[PDB]
């Protein structure tokens, strides 16, 4: 007993024992020198805390698949893993905290692990449907398009639960203020619309600008407004009230990751090729409102801006971690907060302009 | 190096008592005594002592001597913090919330 | 800067008091040493039984020999020697 | 095997110059010092020091234990981590 | 509220020191009072009652070293914080 009793001691010794004074530089390079970011996201329950997704070419290193954990204070390296020789992507965390894991295995298979614990197609898209009632449903767009989605209460999770919805696009945003509702650019060219109650309800397509859209996103502000971006480097505000797009926008990089930013401007990024190409709407005009080559290491990979600080976290396609800080950027204070209605009402007056 | 910024000090959020004692023993002046007097007297007195048992470890066996104490600062997390910043005759002191 | 609040010694016996009790303050750091460093240095100068308390709330009762008695304070720090047997 | 976990682990942590794991007594089971003598007199007199902290930080009341004592000086880094037969000291570079 | 913590004497004694201390509490029993008044009365009264060459000392927090003659010694606590010492040498 006492020497379980002076690990729990040491254990938190440790911990507080690794951090120390500094200025606020975490370039992580746990292994991962061959591998490639596939992912970075960061946590509700701890604003301190990051997850971060790799995939690796050299198998002659530590292991396969990839999820890690750290938080903002934490010593560089990650501090918690998975370990197993299983390639793993499509990750998300648990909707109300951060007690559950889940994954989209590479070969249709789902997989949940406890947190709080030591097909012919493989699944693009993975997340979570919060019913606080219980566990949390669980819906994964496949590679050929087609969504499944289910939930069990016993994790060790078994798929025996399973619903499949007709669908024919990979990357599936849903509705902020109705998630039964969804829309998805499909490869061939147009972008469809439906809903959970009937997977044929509504399956007429946006066609704002009527390409191959392999993104979509949504405004996190008031309006039922949403972002889909082509293969064609175009990008798409899908008003949710409308049939015809109101800012047809259209810039290079856009078929890869877009955002809106965490901050009250309605800012956008692309970045591709160790460079961000950078929109704020909500001061001037759709012309890129700044870029940035990055010499660190080449080919920047996936990014995470957190609300908090301007700290922005990036990975590299050698596996690497970096950030950094430019603050003079943070905000604009009076336009983007409460102007921002008016100008998505003067986009749509923009629309009517390119009438 | 002056009253205005001794009171940008006091103005200086998440402090609770300030406690400036000469090496003597002497709180000049404070803002913890302004809650209750018979605390910055015994924490002067009691961290004084402190500071020469300090000063004989700074100067013992394995802290070449010569060297000085810089600052002491502590922290009784989730009670306070109390920096210790000696000087030739002064010392400040601060309580602050850890 | 010893501050003599109650002695009965001569003039001169007050004098290596405070003279003792400013060595002890310069050597020892801890009021037990203090005391003991005060205390030995009297009983063998002198002879007979010497006592020191050394303190910052104290108050006591005692007896003591005729002009074998300091309560003062050196610093901040209250020293009350005396003198029995 | 905790203890052993740890040692492993500050031992992994680069910076680190002196090891010194001490159980609650003045016993170093293991120290990368050049010389013992030194880390006999710390390992003996910061224990002692480490009973007057304890000492005052219950003097407070007894709301809280010494759980840590990791101070950093110009030259290095001491950690200290108190332990309840042990306590977990380390030499590091102040990074 | 007497809570004894070091005893050497005999229990007859050990009453009588309990209720002396506890008169020299009613004899300075005010925001004014001042410890030495009691101490005096303490020691005075253990003189003239069970011979002299006592001792009284009151307080919370110090550090003693004195030597005493045995079956003369008590220590003691109080819920209102009084830390309570006497001894015969």
């Known amino acids: ?355 | 190096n002056a009253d205005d910024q001794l009171k940008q000090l006091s103005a200086l959020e998440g402090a609770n008592g300030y406690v400036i004692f000469n090496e003597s023993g002497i709180p000049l002046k404070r803002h913890e005594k302004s809650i209750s007097h018979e605390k910055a007297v015994h924490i002067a007195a009691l961290v004084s002592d402190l500071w020469n048992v300090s000063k004989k470890v700074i100067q013992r066996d394995l802290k070449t001597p010569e060297n000085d104490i810089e600052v002491i600062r502590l922290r009784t997390k989730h009670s306070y913090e109390y920096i210790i910043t000696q000087s030739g005759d002064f010392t400040m002191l601060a309580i602050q919330l850890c | 800067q010893p501050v003599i609040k109650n002695s009965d010694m001569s003039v001169e016996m007050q004098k290596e008091v405070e003279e003792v009790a400013k060595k002890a303050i310069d050597y020892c750091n801890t009021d037990k040493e203090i005391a003991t460093f005060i205390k030995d240095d009297f009983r063998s100068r002198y002879h007979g039984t010497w006592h020191c308390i050394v303190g910052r709330n104290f108050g006591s009762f005692v007896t003591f020999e005729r002009s074998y008695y300091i309560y003062l304070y050196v610093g901040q720090l209250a020293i009350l020697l005396f003198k029995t047997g | 095997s905790e203890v052993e976990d740890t040692l492993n682990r500050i031992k992994t942590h680069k910076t680190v110059l002196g090891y010194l794991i001490v159980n609650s007594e003045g016993g170093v089971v293991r120290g990368a010092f050049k010389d013992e003598e030194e880390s006999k007199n710390i390992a003996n007199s910061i224990p002692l020091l480490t009973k007057k902290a304890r000492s005052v930080v219950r003097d407070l009341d007894p709301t809280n234990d010494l759980v840590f004592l990791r101070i950093q000086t110009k030259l290095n880094e001491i950690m200290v981590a108190p332990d309840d037969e042990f306590s977990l000291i380390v030499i590091q570079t102040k990074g | 509220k007497a809570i004894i913590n070091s005893s050497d004497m005999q229990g007859d004694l050990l009453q009588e020191a309990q209720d002396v201390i506890q008169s020299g509490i009613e004899n300075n029993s005010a925001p004014v009072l001042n410890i030495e008044a009691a101490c005096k009365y303490i020691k005075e009264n253990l003189d003239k009652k069970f011979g002299p060459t006592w001792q009284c000392i009151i307080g919370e927090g110090y550090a003693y070293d004195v030597t005493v003659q045995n079956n003369t010694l008590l220590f003691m606590f109080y819920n209102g914080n009084l830390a309570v010492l006497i001894f015969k040498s």
């Open chain 1, 1 to 355: 007993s006492m020497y379980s009793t002076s690990f729990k001691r040491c254990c938190k010794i440790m911990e507080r024992m690794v951090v120390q004074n500094d200025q606020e530089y975490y370039w992580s390079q746990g292994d991962q020198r061959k591998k490639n970011v596939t992912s970075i996201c960061w946590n509700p329950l701890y604003p301190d805390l990051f997850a971060v997704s790799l995939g690796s070419y050299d198998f002659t290193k530590q292991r396969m698949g990839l999820i890690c954990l750290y938080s903002l204070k934490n010593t560089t390296h990650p501090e918690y893993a998975f370990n197993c020789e299983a390639g793993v992507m499509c990750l998300d965390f648990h909707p109300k905290s951060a007690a559950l894991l889940a994954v989209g295995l590479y070969d249709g298979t789902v997989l949940v692990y406890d947190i709080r614990n030591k097909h012919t197609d493989p699944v693009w898209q993975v997340k979570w449907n919060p019913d606080t009632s219980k566990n949390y449903n669980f819906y994964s767009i496949s590679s050929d398009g087609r969504v499944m989605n289910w939930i069990l209460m016993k994790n060790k999770n078994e798929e025996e639960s399973t619903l499949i919805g007709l669908a024919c696009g990979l990357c599936f945003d849903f509705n902020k203020f109705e998630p039964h509702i969804f829309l998805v650019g499909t490869e061939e060219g147009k972008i469809h619309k439906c809903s959970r109650a009937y997977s044929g309800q509504y399956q007429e397509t946006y066609n704002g600008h009527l390409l191959a859209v392999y993104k979509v996103k949504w405004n996190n502000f008031h309006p039922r407004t949403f972002i889909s971006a082509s293969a064609d480097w175009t990008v798409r505000i899908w008003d949710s009230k409308y049939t015809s797009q109101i800012i047809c926008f259209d810039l290079s990089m856009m078929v890869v990751d877009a955002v809106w930013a965490p901050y009250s401007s309605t800012v956008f990024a692309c970045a591709t090729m160790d460079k961000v190409q950078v929109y704020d709407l909500n001061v001037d005009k759709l012309n890129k409102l700044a870029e940035q080559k990055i010499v660190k290491q080449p080919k920047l990979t996936n990014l995470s801006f957190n609300y908090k600080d301007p700290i922005l976290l990036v990975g590299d396609s050698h596996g690497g971690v970096t950030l950094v800080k430019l603050s003079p950027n943070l905000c604009k204070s009076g336009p983007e907060i409460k102007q921002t209605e008016d100008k998505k009402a003067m986009e749509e007056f923009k629309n009517v302009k390119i009438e």
